[PDB]
Amino acid sequence: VDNKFNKEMRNAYWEIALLPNLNNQQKRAFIRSLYDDPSQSANLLAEAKKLNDAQAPK
């Protein structure tokens, strides 16, 4: 695949898995979504944080 994939994901990838409160399917979902559309990587990462904030206590 074109280098563009690696260059874009470098900005957002492991950070998605960093959140420990995201459900099993939720974690795998975002990482899978990256392949589906890397242009949304910025959105997916923010979206992951959204679920993290939501499920997080307090």
Cβ–Cβ under 8 Å, residues 44 and 33: yes
DSSP per position, 34-58 = HHH-GGGHHHHHHHHHHHHHHHS--
What does the block give as tokens for 29?
């979902």
CA distances from 19 to 2, 16, 35 (A): 29, 6, 20
Count: domains in the chain: 1
Q: Which DSSP category does 21 fall into? A: S
What does the block give as tokens for 46?
């923010």
Question: Which CATH number covers residue 3?
Answer: 1.20.5.420
Give the C-alpha separation, 20 to 56, whole Å.
9
- Residues comprising the chain, all counted: 58
Give the C-alpha separation, 48 to 11, whole Å.
14
Give the C-alpha separation, 50 to 54, whole Å.
6
Domain span at 8 = 1-58
In one letter, which amino acid is 57? P
